[PDB]
Amino acid sequence: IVGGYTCGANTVPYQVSLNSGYHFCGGSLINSQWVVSAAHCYKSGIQVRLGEDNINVVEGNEQFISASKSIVHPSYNSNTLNNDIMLIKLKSAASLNSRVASISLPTSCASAGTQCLISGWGNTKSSGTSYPDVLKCLKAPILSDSSCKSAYPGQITSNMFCAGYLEGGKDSCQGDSGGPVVCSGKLQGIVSWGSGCAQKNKPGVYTKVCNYVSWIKQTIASN
Numbered sequence: 078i079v080g081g082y083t084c085g086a087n088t089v090p091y092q093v094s095l096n097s098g099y100h101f102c103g104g105s106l107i108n109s110q111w112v113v114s115a116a117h118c119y120k121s122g123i124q125v126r127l128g129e130d131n132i133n134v135v136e137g138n139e140q141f142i143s144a145s146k147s148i149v150h151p152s153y154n155s156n157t158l159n160n161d162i163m164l165i166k167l168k169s170a171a172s173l174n175s176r177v178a179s180i181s182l183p184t185s186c187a188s189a190g191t192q193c194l195i196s197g198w199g200n201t202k203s204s205g206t207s208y209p210d211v212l213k214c215l216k217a218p219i220l221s222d223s224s225c226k227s228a229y230p231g232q233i234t235s236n237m238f239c240a241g242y243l244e245g246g247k248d249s250c251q252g253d254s255g256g257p258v259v260c261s262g263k264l265q266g267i268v269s270w271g272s273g274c275a276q277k278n279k280p281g282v283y284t285k286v287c288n289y290v291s292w293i294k295q296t297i298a299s300n
């Protein structure tokens with residue numbers, strides 16, 4: 078996250094870190110046994126880390142649970158990043174409390190102008206590299222589809238939305254991928270892609286979760 082603020086420990090209780098020896102992507106806890114992330118975060122050998130603030134220090138609220146199954150969306154296209162969504166089942170259920178909690182799925186799609194919260198452990202610089210150890214947060218609005226398509230001609234599908242600031246300065250970045258965009262207490266987006274971080278006229282692009290609720294619910298019910 079570029080241009081954000083330190084969230085505070087366990088203030089984003091649905092945020093997870095995906096770990097393969099190191100943090101590589103975010104995700105969101107949607108019930109005691111399932112996480113949703115980006116398909117472009119797929120790899121084998123995922124450990125899900127819940128209850129994290131500092132990802133390099135054991136602070137006492139962590140739960141570390143290995144994945145038993147990963148399910149990339151049937152129509153994910155790695156060239157265009159259309160359908161950039163994946164489900165991860167945990168080998169055992171997490172223990173839910175105030176500091177480790179699920180986030181609700183949306184019943185309706187959020188409109189442009191809605192303010193959302195984006196969070197992650199990704200790069201904090203637009204030029205160069207500095208990775209934080211504690212969770213960073215950013216408040217940002219959903220942009221109109223017309224502004225999003227104007228920023229990225231030929232690249233925005235109905236399964237994507239833009240959020241952020243056309244003036245630049247504040248954005249998600251590498252290492253935030255897979256993490257949550259929460260608006261009005263519901264999971265509306267997944268950090269997906271963009272051109273660089275925090276550049277003028279190049280806002281972040283997010284997977285539009287409201288288009289996937291039926292797939293999520295049916296997949297969880299049968300796996």
Ligand SMILES: [NH3+]Cc1ccccc1
Pocket residue numbers: 248249250251252253254268269270271272273274275280281282
């Ligand atoms: N600035 C949006 C973004 C770029 C690369 C990875 C994740 C997010």
Ligand SMILES: [Ca+2]
Pocket residue numbers: 129130131132133134135136139
């Ligand atoms: Ca920790």
